[PDB]
Design a protein around this ligand. Structure first.
Ligand SMILES: Cc1cc2nc3c(=O)[nH]c(=O)nc-3n(C[C@H](O)[C@H](O)[C@H](O)COP(=O)(O)OP(=O)(O)OC[C@H]3O[C@@H](n4cnc5c(N)ncnc54)[C@H](O)[C@@H]3O)c2cc1C
Ligand SMILES: Cc1cc2nc3c(=O)[nH]c(=O)nc-3n(C[C@H](O)[C@H](O)[C@H](O)COP(=O)(O)OP(=O)(O)OC[C@H]3O[C@@H](n4cnc5c(N)ncnc54)[C@H](O)[C@@H]3O)c2cc1C
Lengths: 461, 461
C-alpha cells in the first residue's frame, strides 16, 4: 500500500474539486499548491476580472443616468480602494476553498510539488518523498514569456494587472484574445487612454465575423485606438519610468504601462514529465485520453495543463468525470462538444456553436438571421451602441448551429442558448417561441426571414 | 363592393399589425385610432414602463458603486425631465407606427369608430358612415374604474401615473398584480415613500411560491410597506390636497397619491356591438373562437379586448394568425401554451411554464431544483440581495415543466428558457450543457441533485 490513494498537484479549479470529492468518499488524499488556493480563476482570472468589469461599468451608468432625469454629482474613482476590496474577497474565497478540503477530510499542503518516480511525488517545501496510487496533475498555465523581445521585464501581465501601484493615465495592450480585449474595456471605462496592438487582421480571430467586426467598431467609436496587423519590436523606458514601445508600422508609443496578453502556456517546465513518462505535445501541453489519463498509468491530467479548452467549468467537469470513473465505479468521458462562452468586453460577447465561416465550410446551404439595433436604454441614455444578434442555421435539417450576441447581458444569454443548441433545437423552435416584451432576446424569436444565405461558400441572400 | 376590404378599429399593437400586414398585401384597408397610434404598450404600457424602471434602477447603481472604489457625490432626480424624455420617445415611436402604415398603403384616420350594421362602420369625428368586407376589433381595454369606491375620483391609474404633474412624496398603491408591483418599485426607486395594499393573501397570486414570497421579502426589506388581506373602505381629500384612505385593518393612511392598479376592462361600452349582434361575456370582453372570430361572420376580435392573455406579443401573434387565416387560406390558431413572461419589478421576475403547486397536482412525482444565492456583484456592493432560480421537472419524463427566476435579467432569461421549454427540453439536456462562468445562469445547469421531491402532491421530508 502507498502513502495516499490520491495526490493532487495544483490547488486550482480542477484539483480542488478532484481532491475534495475524493476525500468526501473516505479516500486518503493529499493536495499541493505553490501559490494560493482557488487557482487562477478565483485569484487572478474570472473572479477579479469580472469584479473589475463591474467597476469599469459604473462610469457608463453615471452618464446614462442624465438621460433619465438624474443630475449626478462629481464622481471619483480610487484604484487603491478597488484593489483593497478585491483582495479581501479573494482572501475570503480562498478561505472557503481551503475549508472545503479540510471538511471533506483531505490533507492540505503548502508547496510546489514535482514528479519523481512513476508514482512518487517530490515535495519542495519540506523536501520529502510521498507515494500515491493515483496522481492528478491539475497544474494549469501562466502568461506567455516573450523573453526574446527586449524589455519584457518592464511589462506586465494578467498576474499583476490587478495589483498595480496606480491607475495609469495610458496603457498599451498587445494581443487580440479575450483577456486582451477585456482589460482594454476595463481600463478605458476607468478613464485610461487605451491602445490595442495585434498581429492578426481582425481581433478575436476565432469568433464570428460579426462579433469580431462589431466589437472593433464600437471600441474604436468609444475611443480605443486599435492597430491591427502590427507588432512591438522592443520596450524600453524613458527617464520618467514610463514605457516606450517600438512598433513596426505605427511608429513609437509612450505609455504608463505595457501589457502582454498574447496567449498562455502550461506550467510544465521541470515538473518531472520525462522522469515519470508523461507524453507532452509541442505546445508544451499534456496529452491525455477520454478519461484524462496520461501516458503513465497512475497519472491523470486535467484543466489548462492539457491545452484543450481553457475555461473553469471545463476543469470542473473533468474533475467530476475523473472521480466517477476512478472511484464511483461509473466510467464517464468529459464532453467538449458545443461549449458556450463569454467575453466580458464592453459591449459583451456571448457565443455558442460554430462561426459563419466555419458553418459555411461544414455545410452546403446555411441561413443567416441577423439583428442590429439601438438597445432601449440607449434610446434615452443617448449612447451610440448597437446590439448585434446573429443566428447561423443549417438549411438541410433547420438546425441552429451557431448563436452570437453582442450587447448587454450577452454572457447570460450565451449560457441559455447553450442548452438550446445542445438539444439540437431548430430555427423553427425559435420561431414558435412566444416573444417576451420588452426584452432584447425577443429579437431571436421573430426573425422569420433570413438576412441572407450562403451556398457553396458564397453569400447570396 | 365595399368601401374597404378591411376596417380595423383600434390603433394599438393588434390593430396596427393587422392593418399594416393586410395593406401590404394590396388590400383596401382603413384604420381608426381615437387617441394615439401605437396603443397602450407604446404610449402608457410596456415601453414607458420599462423606461421608468431604468430611471428607478440608477438609485441603486449610485450606492452600489461605493463598494467598487467609487465615491459619487449626491445625485438628484428631476421628474419633469424623465416625463419629458419619455414623451420625446413615445412621440417618435407613435410617428414610426404612423409612417409604417402609410408606407404599406393603409388609410389612417384619427377618430373613434363605432359599429352600424355588421359590415358598416361609423366614424364619429367626421360623422360619416363606411362599409368594409371584413372588420377587426382591436380595441383593447382600459384601467378599471371602481365607481363603487367612495372618492375614487381622487385616485390615479397607470394612465395618469406616467404623467403626474409632480412627483408625489408619498404614494399608496392598491393592487397585487404585475402593474401594482412594477409601479411600487418604480416609485420607491425614485424616493417616493411607497405603500402597497392588496385584498388577497399574497402578491402576484398566479406566480410560483418562491417568486411571490421572494419578491415580497426583497420589497419590504428595502423599505416598502406591504399590506396583505386588506381593502380600501374609502378615499377622501384632506385640507392640504393630500389623500386620506380608509382601511378595514390598518386604519387611515395619508399619501400624496392613491393609485388603483386592480385590473383592466375592455372598451366595449357604446361600441355598437349590440347593434351588430357581437356576443359579449359578463366581464364585458368579446367572445371569440381560436381564430379570433366574433359571433358575427364578417367580424374578428383580437388583443386585450378578448378576455385572453393580456400581453402585447399575444396581440401581435393573434393578428398574424388572423392575416394567415382570413387571407392566406392557412387556418391556424394563436392559442398557445407555455408563454414565458417577465415582471419588471426589482428584483425582476422571469417565468416560463407552470408553478410548483400546479405541477404537484398535475403529475404524481416531480423533482424541484432550487438555487438561492448572493449575486456576484453583491459580494462587493454589500447589497443584501438573493437570487432565486427554480426549475420544476416531471419525474416520469425528465421534462422541465417550469422555470422561475427572481433576480437580475430574469426577463431575458425567461425568453431564452422559453425556447427550451417550447421544444420540450429535459433536465438532462440542461445537465449536459457546459457551464458559462462567471454567470448567474450557470446555476441552472449544475444542480445535478434535486433539492427536494414531491410525490402525490406532498413533499418528501
Ligand atoms: C485574465 C484571465 C481571465 C479569465 N477569465 C475566465 C472566465 O471568464 N471564464 C472561465 O471559465 N475561465 C477564465 N479564465 C481561465 C481559468 O482561470 C482557467 O481556465 C481555470 O482556472 C483552469 O483551472 P485549472 O485548475 O486547470 O488551473 P488553475 O486554476 O490555474 O490551477 C493551478 C494551480 O496550481 C498551482 N500550481 C502550479 N504548479 C504547481 C506545482 N508544481 N505544485 C503545486 N501547485 C502548483 C498554481 O499556483 C495554480 O494556482 C481566465 C484566465 C485568466 C488568466
Ligand atoms: C402599465 C402597463 C404595463 C404593461 N406592460 C407590459 C409588458 O411589459 N409586456 C407586455 O407584453 N405587455 C404589457 N402590457 C399589456 C399591453 O400593453 C397590451 O396587452 C397590448 O397593448 C394589447 O394591445 P391591443 O391590440 O389589445 O390594443 P391596445 O394596445 O390596448 O390599443 C388599442 C387602441 O384602440 C383604441 N380604441 C379603443 N376603443 C376604440 C374605439 N371604440 N374606436 C376607436 N379606437 C379605439 C385605444 O385607445 C387603443 O389605442 C402592459 C399594460 C399596461 C397597462
Amino acid at each position: 500500500a502507498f502513502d495516499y490513494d490520491l495526490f493532487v498537484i495544483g490547488g486550482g479549479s480542477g484539483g480542488v474539486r478532484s481532491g475534495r470529492l475524493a476525500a468526501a468518499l473516505g479516500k486518503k488524499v493529499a493536495i499541493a499548491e505553490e501559490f494560493r488556493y482557488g487557482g487562477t480563476c478565483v485569484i487572478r482570472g474570472c473572479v477579479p476580472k469580472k469584479l473589475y468589469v463591474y467597476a469599469s461599468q459604473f462610469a457608463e451608468h453615471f452618464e446614462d443616468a442624465a438621460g433619465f432625469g438624474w443630475t449626478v454629482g462629481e464622481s471619483r474613482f480610487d484604484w487603491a480602494k478597488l484593489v483593497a476590496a478585491k483582495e479581501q474577497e479573494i482572501a475570503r474565497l480562498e478561505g472557503l476553498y481551503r475549508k472545503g478540503l479540510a471538511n471533506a477530510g483531505a490533507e492540505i499542503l503548502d508547496t510546489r510539488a514535482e514528479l519523481a518516480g512513476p508514482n512518487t511525488v517530490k515535495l519542495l517545501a519540506s523536501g520529502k518523498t510521498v507515494t500515491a496510487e493515483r496522481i492528478v496533475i491539475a497544474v494549469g498555465g501562466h502568461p506567455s514569456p516573450h523573453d526574446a523581445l527586449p524589455g519584457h521585464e518592464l511589462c506586465i501581465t494578467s498576474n499583476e494587472a490587478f495589483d498595480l501601484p496606480a491607475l495609469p493615465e495610458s496603457i498599451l495592450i498587445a494581443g487580440g484574445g479575450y483577456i486582451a480585449v477585456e482589460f482594454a474595456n476595463i481600463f478605458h471605462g476607468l478613464g485610461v487612454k487605451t491602445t490595442l496592438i495585434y498581429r492578426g487582421k481582425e481581433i478575436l480571430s476565432r469568433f464570428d465575423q460579426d462579433m469580431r467586426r462589431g466589437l472593433h467598431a464600437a471600441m474604436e467609436e468609444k475611443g480605443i485606438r486599435i492597430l491591427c496587423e502590427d507588432i512591438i519590436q522592443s520596450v524600453s523606458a524613458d527617464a520618467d519610468g514610463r514605457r516606450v514601445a517600438t512598433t513596426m508600422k505605427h511608429g513609437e508609443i509612450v505609455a504608463d504601462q505595457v501589457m502582454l496578453a498574447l496567449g498562455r502556456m502550461p506550467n510544465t517546465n521541470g515538473l518531472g514529465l520525462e522522469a515519470a513518462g508523461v507524453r507532452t505535445n509541442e505546445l508544451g501541453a499534456i496529452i491525455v485520453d477520454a478519461f484524462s489519463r496520461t501516458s503513465t498509468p497512475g497519472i491523470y491530467a486535467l484543466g489548462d495543463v492539457t491545452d484543450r479548452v481553457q475555461l473553469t467549468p471545463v476543469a470542473i467537469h473533468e474533475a467530476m468525470c475523473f472521480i466517477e470513473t476512478e472511484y464511483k465505479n461509473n466510467p464517464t468521458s468529459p464532453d467538449h462538444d458545443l461549449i458556450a462562452t463569454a467575453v466580458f468586453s464592453q459591449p459583451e460577447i456571448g457565443t455558442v456553436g460554430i462561426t459563419e465561416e466555419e458553418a459555411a465550410r461544414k455545410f452546403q446551404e446555411i441561413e443567416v438571421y441577423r439583428a442590429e439595433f439601438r438597445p432601449m436604454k440607449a434610446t434615452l441614455s443617448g449612447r451610440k451602441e448597437k446590439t448585434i444578434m446573429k443566428l447561423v442555421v443549417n438549411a438541410a435539417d433547420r438546425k441552429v448551429v451557431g448563436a452570437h450576441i453582442l450587447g448587454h447581458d450577452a454572457g447570460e444569454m450565451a449560457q441559455l442558448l447553450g442548452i438550446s443548441l445542445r438539444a439540437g433545437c431548430t430555427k423553427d423552435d425559435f420561431d414558435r417561441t412566444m416573444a417576451v416584451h420588452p426584452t432584447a432576446a425577443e429579437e431571436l424569436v421573430t426573425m422569420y426571414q433570413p438576412s441572407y444565405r450562403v451556398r457553396n461558400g458564397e453569400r447570396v441572400g
